Coordinates of C-alpha atoms in Angstrom, one line a residue:
Chain A
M1 CA 7.6 -11.9 -22.1
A2 CA 3.9 -10.9 -22.1
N3 CA 4.1 -9.5 -25.6
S4 CA 5.1 -12.5 -27.7
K5 CA 6.3 -11.4 -31.2
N6 CA 6.5 -14.7 -33.0
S7 CA 4.2 -13.8 -36.0
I8 CA 4.7 -10.8 -38.1
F9 CA 1.0 -10.3 -39.2
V10 CA -1.0 -9.6 -36.0
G11 CA -3.8 -7.5 -37.4
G12 CA -7.2 -8.6 -36.1
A13 CA -9.1 -11.7 -35.8
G14 CA -11.2 -11.4 -39.0
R15 CA -8.8 -9.8 -41.5
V16 CA -6.9 -12.0 -43.8
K17 CA -3.5 -10.9 -45.4
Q18 CA -2.8 -10.0 -49.0
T19 CA 0.1 -12.0 -50.2
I20 CA 2.5 -11.1 -53.0
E21 CA 4.8 -14.0 -54.1
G22 CA 8.1 -13.6 -55.9
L23 CA 11.7 -14.5 -56.3
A24 CA 14.6 -13.4 -53.8
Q25 CA 17.8 -11.6 -54.4
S26 CA 19.2 -11.4 -51.0
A27 CA 18.8 -12.8 -47.5
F28 CA 16.7 -10.3 -45.6
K29 CA 15.0 -10.6 -42.2
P30 CA 11.3 -10.8 -41.9
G31 CA 9.6 -7.4 -41.3
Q32 CA 11.7 -5.2 -43.6
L33 CA 10.4 -3.1 -46.4
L34 CA 10.7 -4.6 -49.8
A35 CA 10.4 -3.4 -53.5
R36 CA 9.8 -5.5 -56.6
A37 CA 12.2 -5.1 -59.5
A38 CA 12.6 -6.4 -63.0
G39 CA 12.0 -10.0 -63.8
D40 CA 9.9 -11.3 -61.0
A41 CA 12.4 -10.9 -58.1
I42 CA 12.1 -9.0 -54.9
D43 CA 14.7 -7.7 -52.5
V44 CA 15.2 -4.8 -50.0
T45 CA 14.0 -1.5 -51.3
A46 CA 17.2 0.9 -51.3
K47 CA 15.2 3.8 -52.4
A48 CA 15.6 7.1 -50.7
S49 CA 13.7 8.1 -47.6
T50 CA 12.0 11.3 -49.3
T51 CA 10.4 9.4 -52.2
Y52 CA 6.7 8.9 -52.3
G53 CA 4.4 6.4 -54.1
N54 CA 6.0 3.3 -52.7
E55 CA 3.8 0.3 -51.9
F56 CA 3.6 -1.0 -48.4
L57 CA 5.2 -4.4 -48.9
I58 CA 6.8 -6.0 -46.0
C59 CA 8.5 -9.5 -45.7
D60 CA 6.2 -12.0 -44.0
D61 CA 7.7 -14.7 -41.9
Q62 CA 8.3 -18.0 -43.8
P63 CA 6.2 -21.0 -43.0
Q64 CA 6.8 -23.2 -40.0
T65 CA 7.4 -26.2 -42.2
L66 CA 10.2 -24.5 -44.2
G67 CA 12.4 -23.3 -41.4
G68 CA 10.8 -19.9 -40.9
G69 CA 10.4 -17.6 -37.8
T70 CA 10.5 -13.9 -37.0
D71 CA 14.4 -14.0 -36.7
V72 CA 15.3 -16.6 -39.4
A73 CA 16.5 -15.0 -42.5
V74 CA 15.2 -16.2 -45.9
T75 CA 17.3 -18.3 -48.2
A76 CA 18.5 -16.5 -51.3
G77 CA 17.1 -17.2 -54.8
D78 CA 13.9 -18.9 -53.7
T79 CA 10.2 -18.0 -53.4
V80 CA 9.8 -15.4 -50.7
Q81 CA 6.1 -15.0 -49.5
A82 CA 5.4 -11.3 -48.6
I83 CA 2.7 -9.2 -47.5
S84 CA 0.9 -6.2 -49.0
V85 CA -0.5 -4.2 -46.1
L86 CA -4.1 -2.8 -46.5
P87 CA -4.8 0.4 -44.5
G88 CA -6.2 -0.5 -41.1
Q89 CA -4.2 -3.4 -40.1
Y90 CA -1.6 -3.9 -37.4
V91 CA 1.7 -5.4 -38.4
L92 CA 5.2 -5.9 -36.7
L93 CA 7.6 -3.6 -38.5
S94 CA 11.4 -3.5 -37.9
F95 CA 13.1 -0.2 -36.7
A96 CA 16.5 1.2 -36.8
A97 CA 18.7 2.1 -34.0
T98 CA 18.6 5.1 -31.4
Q99 CA 14.9 6.2 -31.3
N100 CA 12.4 5.8 -28.6
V101 CA 8.6 5.6 -29.2
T102 CA 6.8 7.7 -26.5
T103 CA 3.3 8.4 -27.7
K104 CA 1.0 5.9 -29.4
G105 CA 0.4 7.6 -32.8
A106 CA 3.5 8.9 -34.3
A107 CA 4.3 8.9 -37.9
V108 CA 6.3 5.9 -39.3
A109 CA 8.5 6.8 -42.1
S110 CA 10.9 4.4 -44.1
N111 CA 14.7 4.5 -43.7
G112 CA 16.8 3.8 -46.7
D113 CA 18.3 0.6 -45.6
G114 CA 14.9 -1.4 -45.5
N115 CA 13.9 -0.5 -41.9
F116 CA 11.7 2.0 -40.4
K117 CA 12.0 5.3 -38.4
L118 CA 10.2 8.0 -36.7
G119 CA 10.4 10.9 -39.2
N120 CA 8.8 14.3 -39.9
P121 CA 5.7 13.8 -41.7
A122 CA 6.2 16.7 -44.2
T123 CA 9.0 15.4 -46.4
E124 CA 8.7 11.7 -46.4
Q125 CA 5.8 9.1 -47.1
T126 CA 4.1 8.1 -44.0
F127 CA 3.4 4.4 -43.9
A128 CA 2.1 3.3 -40.6
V129 CA 1.4 4.6 -37.0
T130 CA 2.9 3.3 -33.7
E131 CA 1.0 1.3 -31.3
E132 CA 3.4 0.3 -28.6
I133 CA 5.6 2.5 -26.2
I134 CA 9.0 0.8 -26.1
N135 CA 12.6 2.1 -26.7
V136 CA 14.7 0.3 -29.1
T137 CA 18.7 0.5 -29.4
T138 CA 19.7 -2.6 -31.6
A139 CA 18.6 -2.4 -35.2
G140 CA 16.2 -5.1 -36.1
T141 CA 13.7 -5.0 -33.2
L142 CA 10.0 -5.7 -33.8
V143 CA 7.5 -2.9 -32.9
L144 CA 3.8 -3.1 -33.3
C145 CA 2.3 -0.5 -35.8
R146 CA -1.1 0.2 -37.3
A147 CA -0.9 0.6 -41.2
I148 CA -3.2 3.5 -41.6
Chain B
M59 CA 10.5 -41.1 -44.2
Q60 CA 14.3 -41.3 -43.4
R61 CA 16.3 -39.9 -46.2
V62 CA 19.4 -42.0 -46.4
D63 CA 21.6 -38.9 -46.6
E64 CA 21.1 -38.6 -42.9
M65 CA 19.7 -41.8 -41.3
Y66 CA 21.8 -41.6 -38.2
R67 CA 19.7 -39.3 -36.3
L68 CA 16.5 -40.2 -34.3
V69 CA 13.7 -37.9 -33.6
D70 CA 10.6 -38.2 -31.4
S71 CA 8.4 -35.0 -32.0
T72 CA 6.1 -35.1 -29.0
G73 CA 7.0 -32.0 -27.2
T74 CA 7.4 -30.8 -23.6
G75 CA 6.7 -27.0 -23.5
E76 CA 7.3 -25.0 -20.3
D77 CA 6.1 -25.3 -16.7
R78 CA 4.6 -22.0 -15.2
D79 CA 6.0 -20.9 -11.8
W80 CA 6.1 -21.5 -8.1
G81 CA 2.8 -20.2 -6.7
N82 CA 1.5 -18.6 -9.9
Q83 CA -2.2 -18.0 -9.5
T84 CA -3.1 -19.1 -5.9
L85 CA -5.0 -16.0 -5.1
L86 CA -6.8 -15.7 -8.2
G87 CA -7.7 -19.4 -8.2
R88 CA -9.7 -18.6 -5.0
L89 CA -11.4 -15.5 -6.0
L90 CA -12.7 -16.9 -9.4
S91 CA -13.9 -20.0 -7.4
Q92 CA -16.2 -18.0 -5.0
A93 CA -17.3 -15.5 -7.5
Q94 CA -20.9 -14.3 -8.2
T95 CA -22.0 -14.4 -11.9
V96 CA -23.7 -11.3 -13.3
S97 CA -25.1 -10.6 -16.7
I98 CA -22.9 -9.2 -19.5
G99 CA -23.5 -5.5 -20.3
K100 CA -23.6 -4.4 -16.5
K101 CA -20.6 -2.4 -16.5
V102 CA -20.9 -1.0 -12.9
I103 CA -22.2 -2.6 -9.7
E104 CA -23.3 -0.8 -6.5
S105 CA -23.7 -1.6 -2.8
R106 CA -24.7 0.3 0.3
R107 CA -23.2 0.8 3.8
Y108 CA -25.1 2.6 6.5
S109 CA -23.8 4.5 9.6
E110 CA -23.8 4.8 13.4
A111 CA -25.2 7.7 15.4
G112 CA -27.1 8.6 18.4
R113 CA -26.7 11.1 21.3
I114 CA -27.6 10.1 24.8
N115 CA -28.1 12.0 28.0
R116 CA -28.3 11.0 31.7
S117 CA -29.8 12.3 34.8
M118 CA -31.1 11.3 38.2
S119 CA -34.9 12.4 37.7
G120 CA -35.5 11.4 34.0
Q121 CA -37.3 14.7 33.0
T122 CA -34.6 16.0 30.5
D123 CA -34.7 16.6 26.9
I124 CA -34.1 13.4 25.0
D125 CA -32.0 13.8 21.9
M126 CA -32.3 12.1 18.6
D127 CA -30.4 11.4 15.3
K128 CA -30.4 9.1 12.3
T129 CA -28.1 7.2 10.0
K130 CA -26.8 8.3 6.7
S131 CA -25.7 6.2 3.7
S132 CA -23.2 6.0 1.0
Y133 CA -22.5 3.8 -2.0
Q134 CA -19.4 1.8 -3.3
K135 CA -18.8 0.8 -6.9
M136 CA -16.8 -1.6 -9.0
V137 CA -16.4 -2.1 -12.8
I138 CA -16.4 -5.0 -15.2
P139 CA -13.9 -5.0 -18.2
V140 CA -13.6 -7.6 -21.0
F141 CA -10.3 -9.6 -21.8
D142 CA -9.8 -11.4 -25.1
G143 CA -7.0 -13.1 -27.1
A144 CA -6.6 -15.1 -30.3
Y145 CA -4.2 -17.4 -32.2
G146 CA -3.9 -18.8 -35.7
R147 CA -2.0 -20.6 -38.5
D148 CA -2.0 -20.4 -42.3
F149 CA -3.5 -22.9 -44.7
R150 CA -0.5 -24.7 -46.4
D151 CA 1.1 -25.3 -43.0
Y152 CA -1.8 -26.8 -40.9
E153 CA -2.6 -29.2 -43.8
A154 CA 1.2 -30.3 -43.8
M155 CA 1.3 -30.7 -40.1
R156 CA -2.1 -32.6 -40.0
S157 CA -0.3 -35.2 -42.2
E158 CA 2.6 -36.2 -39.7
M159 CA -0.1 -36.0 -36.9
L160 CA 1.5 -33.1 -35.0
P161 CA -1.0 -31.6 -32.6
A162 CA -0.1 -27.9 -33.4
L163 CA -3.5 -26.5 -32.4
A164 CA -4.2 -28.1 -29.1
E165 CA -0.8 -26.8 -28.1
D166 CA -2.1 -23.4 -28.5
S167 CA -5.5 -23.7 -26.9
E168 CA -3.8 -24.9 -23.8
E169 CA -1.3 -22.1 -24.2
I170 CA -3.1 -18.8 -25.0
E171 CA -5.6 -19.8 -22.2
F172 CA -2.8 -19.4 -19.8
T173 CA -1.8 -16.1 -21.0
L174 CA -5.4 -14.8 -20.8
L175 CA -5.5 -15.7 -17.1
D176 CA -1.9 -14.4 -16.5
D177 CA -2.9 -10.9 -17.7
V178 CA -5.7 -10.7 -15.3
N179 CA -2.8 -10.8 -12.7
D180 CA -1.5 -7.6 -14.2
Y181 CA -4.9 -6.1 -13.7
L182 CA -5.5 -7.6 -10.2
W183 CA -2.1 -6.8 -8.7
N184 CA -1.1 -3.6 -10.7
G185 CA -4.5 -2.2 -12.0
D186 CA -5.0 0.2 -14.8
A187 CA -5.9 3.8 -15.1
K188 CA -7.6 3.2 -18.5
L189 CA -11.1 1.5 -17.5
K190 CA -13.1 4.0 -15.6
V191 CA -16.9 4.6 -16.1
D192 CA -17.9 7.2 -13.5
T193 CA -15.6 7.0 -10.6
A194 CA -15.0 3.1 -10.6
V195 CA -11.3 2.6 -11.3
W196 CA -9.5 -0.3 -9.7
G197 CA -5.9 0.8 -9.5
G198 CA -4.4 -2.4 -8.4
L199 CA -3.9 -4.2 -5.0
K200 CA -0.8 -2.2 -4.5
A201 CA -2.0 1.2 -5.3
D202 CA -5.6 1.6 -4.6
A203 CA -7.3 3.8 -2.1
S204 CA -9.4 0.8 -0.9
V205 CA -6.3 -0.9 0.5
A206 CA -4.6 -0.1 3.6
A207 CA -1.0 0.8 3.2
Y208 CA 1.5 -0.4 6.0
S209 CA 5.2 0.1 5.8
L210 CA 7.3 -2.7 7.1
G211 CA 10.3 -1.9 9.4
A212 CA 12.4 -4.9 9.4
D213 CA 13.5 -6.8 6.3
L214 CA 11.7 -10.1 6.3
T215 CA 14.3 -11.9 4.2
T216 CA 17.2 -11.4 6.5
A217 CA 15.6 -11.2 9.9
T218 CA 15.6 -13.9 12.7
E219 CA 12.6 -15.9 14.0
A220 CA 11.8 -13.5 16.8
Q221 CA 11.5 -10.3 14.5
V222 CA 9.0 -12.1 12.1
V223 CA 6.3 -12.7 14.6
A224 CA 6.9 -9.4 16.2
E225 CA 6.4 -7.7 12.7
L226 CA 3.5 -10.0 11.6
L227 CA 1.4 -9.0 14.4
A228 CA 1.9 -5.4 13.7
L229 CA 0.6 -6.1 10.2
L230 CA -2.5 -8.1 11.5
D231 CA -3.3 -5.3 14.0
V232 CA -4.3 -3.0 11.1
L233 CA -7.2 -5.2 10.7
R234 CA -8.2 -6.0 14.2
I235 CA -7.7 -2.7 15.9
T236 CA -7.5 0.4 13.7
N237 CA -9.9 -1.1 11.2
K238 CA -12.3 -3.2 13.5
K239 CA -12.6 -6.1 10.9
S240 CA -13.0 -9.7 12.1
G241 CA -13.1 -13.3 10.8
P242 CA -10.5 -15.7 9.5
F243 CA -7.7 -13.9 7.8
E244 CA -5.3 -15.4 5.1
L245 CA -1.7 -14.4 4.1
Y246 CA 0.1 -14.4 0.8
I247 CA 3.9 -14.1 0.6
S248 CA 6.7 -13.6 -2.0
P249 CA 8.6 -16.6 -3.5
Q250 CA 11.7 -15.2 -1.9
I251 CA 10.3 -15.1 1.7
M252 CA 8.8 -18.5 1.5
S253 CA 12.3 -19.7 0.9
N254 CA 13.9 -17.9 3.8
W255 CA 11.1 -19.1 6.2
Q256 CA 12.4 -22.7 5.8
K257 CA 15.8 -22.2 7.4
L258 CA 17.0 -22.8 10.9
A259 CA 14.9 -21.1 13.8
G260 CA 17.5 -19.8 16.1
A261 CA 15.2 -20.0 19.4
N262 CA 13.8 -23.6 19.6
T263 CA 16.7 -25.6 21.0
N264 CA 15.3 -29.0 21.1
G265 CA 15.5 -30.7 17.7
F266 CA 15.2 -28.8 14.5
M267 CA 12.1 -26.7 13.5
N268 CA 11.7 -24.1 10.8
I269 CA 10.3 -20.5 10.8
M270 CA 7.1 -21.5 9.1
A271 CA 6.4 -24.1 11.8
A272 CA 6.6 -21.1 14.1
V273 CA 4.4 -18.7 12.4
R274 CA 1.5 -21.3 12.1
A275 CA 1.9 -22.2 15.7
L276 CA 2.0 -18.7 17.3
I277 CA -0.5 -17.1 15.0
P278 CA -3.5 -19.4 14.3
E279 CA -5.5 -16.5 12.9
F280 CA -4.1 -17.1 9.6
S281 CA -6.4 -19.5 8.1
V282 CA -4.4 -20.1 4.8
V283 CA -0.8 -19.2 4.3
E284 CA 0.3 -19.7 0.6
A285 CA 2.9 -18.2 -1.7
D286 CA 2.1 -16.1 -4.7
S287 CA 4.5 -15.1 -7.5
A288 CA 2.9 -11.7 -8.0
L289 CA 5.0 -10.3 -5.0
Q290 CA 8.6 -10.1 -5.4
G291 CA 11.2 -9.3 -2.6
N292 CA 10.0 -7.8 0.7
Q293 CA 6.3 -7.5 0.3
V294 CA 3.3 -9.4 1.9
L295 CA -0.5 -9.0 1.9
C296 CA -3.1 -9.9 4.5
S297 CA -6.8 -9.6 3.9
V298 CA -10.2 -11.3 4.1
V299 CA -11.7 -13.2 1.2
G300 CA -15.3 -14.0 0.6
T301 CA -18.3 -11.7 0.0
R302 CA -17.6 -9.5 3.0
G303 CA -14.0 -8.7 1.8
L304 CA -12.0 -9.1 -1.2
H305 CA -14.3 -10.6 -3.9
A306 CA -14.8 -10.9 -7.6
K307 CA -17.8 -10.7 -10.0
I308 CA -17.7 -12.8 -13.3
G309 CA -19.3 -11.1 -16.2
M310 CA -19.0 -13.8 -18.8
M311 CA -17.2 -17.1 -18.1
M312 CA -14.2 -18.2 -20.3
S313 CA -15.6 -19.3 -23.7
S314 CA -13.9 -20.1 -27.0
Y315 CA -15.1 -20.5 -30.6
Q316 CA -13.6 -20.7 -34.1
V317 CA -13.9 -18.1 -36.9
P318 CA -15.6 -20.1 -39.9
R319 CA -13.7 -20.6 -43.0
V320 CA -15.3 -19.2 -46.2
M321 CA -13.0 -19.9 -49.0
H322 CA -10.6 -22.9 -49.4
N323 CA -7.5 -20.9 -48.4
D324 CA -9.0 -19.1 -45.2
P325 CA -6.5 -19.3 -42.4
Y326 CA -7.4 -21.1 -39.3
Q327 CA -8.3 -18.7 -36.3
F328 CA -9.6 -19.2 -32.9
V329 CA -10.6 -16.6 -30.3
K330 CA -10.9 -16.7 -26.4
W331 CA -12.5 -14.1 -24.4
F332 CA -13.3 -13.4 -20.6
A333 CA -14.7 -10.7 -18.5
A334 CA -14.7 -10.0 -14.7
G335 CA -13.9 -7.5 -12.2
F336 CA -12.5 -7.0 -8.7
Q337 CA -13.3 -4.9 -5.6
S338 CA -12.5 -5.0 -1.8
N339 CA -15.2 -4.2 0.8
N340 CA -15.1 -0.9 2.8
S341 CA -17.3 0.3 5.5
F342 CA -19.2 3.7 5.6
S343 CA -16.7 5.7 7.6
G344 CA -13.6 4.2 5.8
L345 CA -12.8 1.1 7.6
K346 CA -10.6 -0.9 5.2
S347 CA -10.5 -4.7 4.8
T348 CA -7.1 -5.4 3.0
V349 CA -3.6 -4.6 4.1
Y350 CA -0.7 -4.5 1.7
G351 CA 2.7 -4.9 3.4
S352 CA 5.3 -2.3 1.9
Chain C
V102 CA 22.4 -38.6 -32.6
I103 CA 19.0 -38.5 -30.7
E104 CA 16.9 -35.3 -31.1
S105 CA 14.0 -34.0 -29.2
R106 CA 11.6 -31.1 -29.7
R107 CA 11.0 -28.3 -27.2
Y108 CA 8.4 -25.8 -28.2
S109 CA 7.7 -22.4 -26.8
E110 CA 5.0 -20.0 -25.3
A111 CA 3.0 -17.2 -27.1
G112 CA 0.0 -15.0 -26.7
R113 CA -1.0 -11.3 -26.9
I114 CA -3.9 -9.9 -24.8
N115 CA -5.5 -6.4 -24.8
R116 CA -7.9 -5.1 -22.2
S117 CA -11.1 -3.4 -23.5
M118 CA -13.8 -1.5 -21.9
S119 CA -16.2 -1.6 -24.7
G120 CA -15.5 -5.0 -26.0
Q121 CA -15.0 -4.0 -29.6
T122 CA -11.5 -3.3 -30.5
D123 CA -9.0 -5.3 -32.7
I124 CA -7.8 -8.4 -30.9
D125 CA -4.5 -10.2 -31.5
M126 CA -3.2 -13.5 -32.8
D127 CA 0.0 -15.6 -32.3
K128 CA 1.5 -19.0 -32.8
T129 CA 3.9 -21.4 -31.2
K130 CA 7.6 -21.6 -32.5
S131 CA 9.7 -24.7 -32.1
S132 CA 13.4 -25.8 -31.6
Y133 CA 15.3 -29.0 -31.1
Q134 CA 18.1 -30.3 -28.8
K135 CA 20.4 -33.2 -29.5
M136 CA 22.5 -35.8 -27.7
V137 CA 25.3 -38.2 -28.9
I138 CA 26.0 -41.9 -28.3
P139 CA 29.7 -42.9 -28.2
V140 CA 31.2 -46.4 -27.8
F141 CA 33.7 -47.5 -25.0
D142 CA 35.8 -50.7 -25.1
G143 CA 38.5 -52.5 -23.2
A144 CA 40.4 -55.7 -23.3
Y145 CA 42.8 -57.9 -21.5
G146 CA 45.1 -61.1 -22.1
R147 CA 47.8 -63.4 -21.2
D148 CA 50.4 -65.6 -23.1
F149 CA 50.2 -69.4 -23.7
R150 CA 53.0 -70.8 -21.5
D151 CA 51.8 -68.8 -18.6
Chain D
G303 CA 15.7 -34.1 -16.3
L304 CA 19.3 -35.6 -16.4
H305 CA 18.8 -38.9 -18.3
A306 CA 20.8 -41.4 -20.1
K307 CA 20.2 -43.5 -23.3
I308 CA 22.0 -46.8 -23.7
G309 CA 23.3 -47.9 -27.1
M310 CA 24.4 -51.3 -26.4
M311 CA 24.5 -53.1 -23.1
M312 CA 27.7 -54.3 -21.6
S313 CA 28.7 -57.5 -23.4
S314 CA 31.9 -59.7 -23.5
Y315 CA 33.4 -62.2 -25.8
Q316 CA 36.5 -64.1 -26.5
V317 CA 38.7 -63.9 -29.5
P318 CA 39.1 -67.3 -30.7
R319 CA 42.4 -69.2 -30.9
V320 CA 43.4 -70.5 -34.3
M321 CA 46.8 -72.2 -33.8
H322 CA 48.2 -74.0 -30.7
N323 CA 50.1 -70.9 -29.4
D324 CA 47.6 -68.2 -29.7
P325 CA 47.4 -66.0 -26.7
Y326 CA 44.2 -65.9 -24.7
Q327 CA 42.3 -62.6 -25.2
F328 CA 39.0 -61.2 -24.1
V329 CA 37.0 -58.0 -25.2
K330 CA 34.3 -55.9 -23.3
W331 CA 32.5 -53.0 -24.8
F332 CA 29.7 -50.6 -24.0
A333 CA 27.9 -47.7 -25.6
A334 CA 25.7 -45.0 -24.0
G335 CA 25.3 -41.3 -23.8
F336 CA 24.1 -38.4 -21.4
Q337 CA 22.1 -35.3 -21.8
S338 CA 20.2 -32.8 -19.4
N339 CA 16.9 -31.2 -20.5
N340 CA 16.6 -27.7 -21.7
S341 CA 13.6 -25.6 -22.6
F342 CA 13.0 -23.1 -25.3
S343 CA 13.9 -20.0 -23.4
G344 CA 17.1 -21.7 -21.7
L345 CA 15.6 -22.6 -18.5
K346 CA 17.9 -25.3 -17.4
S347 CA 17.4 -28.2 -14.9
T348 CA 20.8 -29.0 -13.4
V349 CA 22.8 -26.7 -11.1
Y350 CA 26.6 -27.4 -10.4
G351 CA 27.8 -25.7 -7.2
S352 CA 31.1 -24.0 -7.8

C-alpha cells in the first residue's frame, strides 16, 4: 500500500495541531466526529445532519506508548486526546458505507452516527473537501480530506 | 521493569521490519548512477537531431545539372519534477521512547526514503498526465510515444525453449532492423518469467541445462539480463541505456533536514525531497530506441 | 512466553511540478508475536529382585 | 525463519533408594519450543505443500 494511513493528522510539514483534551463516555474509533457535553466529557456527536454551528472536532489517534493506532478503539472513562481542525489542513476522516468519491473537491457533510458522507451543500454544514479518489463500501474507512 | 503480575514473559524489542521484493529497483539503480546533474529551476531540457538529404545524378560525360539540398533540424524535450515526503511523531511519545532507548526515528529515515524512491517507479514505469510544461509530458515506459510498442504472439510463461529464442529475436529486430540502432542492448524481465526460465530445457539431451543458460548462449547481444518487479506477467522490455538511449537527469540529489522546534512541545518532524526526470533518445525521422514487449 | 516485535512500513508521497504544495507525514506502527515453552518428561524402572 | 528455543537441556537423574527393597527408577526431562517468523502484514516464511 503506497498510501499508508497510520496517522490521523497528515496536514503539512509545518502546521501543528490544536488539541482538546477531555474525558470519555464510550469507545469510539479514531477519525470520527465528536461533540463535548456537560461536565468535561467527550463522546460521539449524535446530532442531526442538518444542524449548523458544530465545531470540527475529530478523535486523534492515541499515543504509541498507550496502545493507540488508527484502528484501535479508545478505552472508556479515560482521557481522550482529540483534535480541533483549523481551516486549511488535511485530516483523515472516516466515511459511511455505499458512496464513491469521484472528483477531488466535493463537499463533506456529517452523518448522524459520527461518520461523514457526501451530502448536498445546501441543507447541511460543510466541514471539509475530498482529496482522494477512492470508493468505499465498509463503514469506517479512512479518506483524506482538506478541512477548508 | 518487570511487574510481578506478569513476570513469565520475555521481550526483546529490537525489531525486524520488512524486506522489499525480488528485483525491485534494478533499472532505476542503473539510471540514477549514470545521470547528469543539472541545476534546480531548469524545468525543461532540450537537444537537437539533424537529418539526411542529397540528390545525386549520373551520366557518362559529366556535363549535367548537379543538384543540391541541405539538412533540417528538430528538437526533443524532457521535464524535471520534484518529489517529497515527510514523517513525524509527537512530544510526549518520543521522550518516552528515548528513555527505553528504542530507535523509533532511524526506523523511519530508513523507511520513508525507500517509499520516496518507490514512487519514482510509478512515474518511470507508468508516467503521469499531470506534469507538462509546454509539450514535455513523460507518459510512462509502457504508454509513451517515444517507446516502440511490439505485441508478443506466444506466451513466454508456458512456451518451450525453442519458442523463446524465436520470439526474443523478433523483439530485438525492432532495434536492429526497423529502427537502425546499434550498441550493446540489455533486457529486463518479469519476476514470473524469471521463474519459468529456470525449468527443464526440452532440447539439450546431454545433462540438464535451463532456458536462461540458452538465452545467454544463443543471443550474446544482451549485455545485461536482470529481473525487475515493475513488470508483471507476460511483458518484457529491451532498450539501450546511457546518454544515447534511456537516460535520466537529476535536478537535486536526495537530501534531508529537520524542521526546527520553537516551543517546548513542538512535534518532531523531518522532510526528504528529490527531483529528477526521464527521457529516451529519438532520431530526427522517428527512429526510436526502446521497445516495450506487450 | 517469549515475545518479539515486528514493525511496519509507512510513507506518503505527492508529486509536484512547482515544488510548493503541502507535503505529507506518517509514522511506523508496531505489533508483537509470541511463542511458548512446554516441558516434556519420561521415566523407566525395574523391581528389586529382578 | 523457523527457529527453536531450548528451555532446559536434556538431563537425567536417579530417584534415590531409601529402604532395601526400593525399586530402581530413573527420570529424563526436556523443555523447548518452536515458532516460525511472521511480519506485520502477514508475509509468512514457511510453506507446507499439501
